[PDB]
Enzyme design. Structure first.
Site, PDB file in Angstrom:
ATOM      1  N   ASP A   1       0.835  -1.198   0.000  1.00  0.00           N
ATOM      2  CA  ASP A   1       0.000   0.000   0.000  1.00  0.00           C
ATOM      3  C   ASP A   1       0.870   1.248   0.000  1.00  0.00           C
ATOM      4  O   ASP A   1       1.335   1.686   1.061  1.00  0.00           O
ATOM      5  CB  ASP A   1      -0.915  -0.015   1.225  1.00  0.00           C
TER       6      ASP A   1
ATOM      7  N   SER B   1      -0.669  15.478 -12.199  1.00  0.00           N
ATOM      8  CA  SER B   1      -0.902  15.115 -13.585  1.00  0.00           C
ATOM      9  C   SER B   1      -1.148  16.372 -14.408  1.00  0.00           C
ATOM     10  O   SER B   1      -1.684  17.370 -13.920  1.00  0.00           O
ATOM     11  CB  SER B   1      -2.111  14.171 -13.660  1.00  0.00           C
TER      12      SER B   1
END
Length: 330
Positions: free
Chosen positions: A35, A199
């Site tokens: 994770d 992004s």
């Protein structure tokens, strides 16, 4: 040193991925959920409330000659999906794919919430976010990667998740045969303890690319892709009959649909998520309403590039003095 381990989907939907991890002496192998959105290595154990164990493999520290109680240390964690666990702490030898760390904090669960109990395939979590998020008190502990870093050939790990197939986690090296083209690296903020990056935009299907900054985290422990409501609405508007359902908890679409791809930007590069990766199947057995793999982050407080996005790429988690993320097509 290096390590290399295969990671395997827990079910036919890629709801999560499990990676075998050796703990203790002799080794006890547990299948952990790696994770990159959390920083605790915790396991089902001989200390876990018996009624909260349902088929998981447990760590028994009393059977490990190298286990030592970390006296006074406790831990307690709550995840974004509302699940939680807590307990005490041992140090022990932990190996992943041939890479060994001695003195790793192994957080032994005394209590786990129902979603953990109900998932017999996940024996615990291995956190790979930054150690500043580790919950051990009163002495915060380091992640497996932080402990291994100085020994690694290069201070990196990579995630190569499969679509409906096994993939690989590598530590300490970048497998140049595992991706196509070049790796595009992008800046990371560690201010929230995550692999947080920006992004450069998105496209839906064959549509034109929209240049817009989307701050989010690379999180292997989250199944889906969570993005701003504007972006998510633009995606699902291209699927006839798709709608957001408050009763189901997100966007659903007719199971008869063919889903468009979704592209996200990494600098000037582009990662294409095929439409099929966004199909999470019937909402309930036999339903013709299917659950979408792109969902709104509104209310979560952060955008999450979860498995749906990451499995479309070869992803480098660069833990150099200034961390960065790399993405390549594959």
């Amino acid at each position: 040193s290096t390590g290399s381990a295969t990671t395997t989907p827990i079910d036919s939907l890629d709801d999560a991925y499990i990676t075998p991890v050796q703990i203790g002496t002799p080794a006890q192998t547990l299948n952990l959920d790696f994770d990159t959105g959390s920083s605790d290595l915790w396991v089902f154990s001989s200390e876990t409330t018996a009624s909260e164990v349902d088929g998981q493999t447990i760590y028994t520290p009393s059977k490990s000659t190298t286990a030592k109680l970390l006296s006074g240390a406790t831990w307690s964690i709550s995840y974004g999906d509302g699940s939680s666990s807590s307990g005490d702490v041992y140090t022990d030898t932990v190996s992943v794919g041939g890479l060994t760390v001695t003195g790793q904090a192994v957080e032994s669960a005394k209590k786990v919430s129902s979603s953990f109990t109900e998932d017999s395939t996940i024996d615990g979590l291995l956190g790979l976010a930054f150690s500043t998020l580790n919950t051990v008190s009163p002495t915060q502990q380091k992640t497996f990667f932080d402990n291994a870093k100085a020994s690694l050939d290069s201070p990196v790990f990579t995630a190569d998740l499969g679509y409906h197939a096994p993939g690989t986690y590598n530590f300490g090296f970048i497998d140049t045969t595992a991706y196509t083209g070049s790796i595009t690296y992008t800046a990371v903020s560690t201010k929230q303890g995550f692999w947080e990056w920006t992004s450069t935009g998105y496209a839906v299907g064959s549509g034109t690319f929209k240049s817009t900054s989307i701050d989010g985290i690379a999180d292997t422990g989250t199944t889906l892709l969570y993005l701003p409501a504007t972006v998510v609405s633009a995606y699902w508007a291209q699927v006839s009959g798709a709608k957001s359902s408050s009763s189901v908890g997100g966007y659903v679409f007719p199971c008869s649909a063919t889903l468009p791809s979704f592209t996200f930007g990494v600098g000037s590069a582009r990662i294409v998520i095929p439409g099929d990766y966004i199909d999470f199947g019937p909402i309930s057995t036999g339903s013709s309403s299917c659950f979408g793999g792109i969902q709104s982050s509104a209310g979560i407080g952060i955008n999450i590039f979860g498995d749906v996005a990451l499995k479309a790429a070869f992803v480098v988690f660069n833990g150099a003095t200034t961390p960065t993320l790399g993405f390549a097509s594959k």
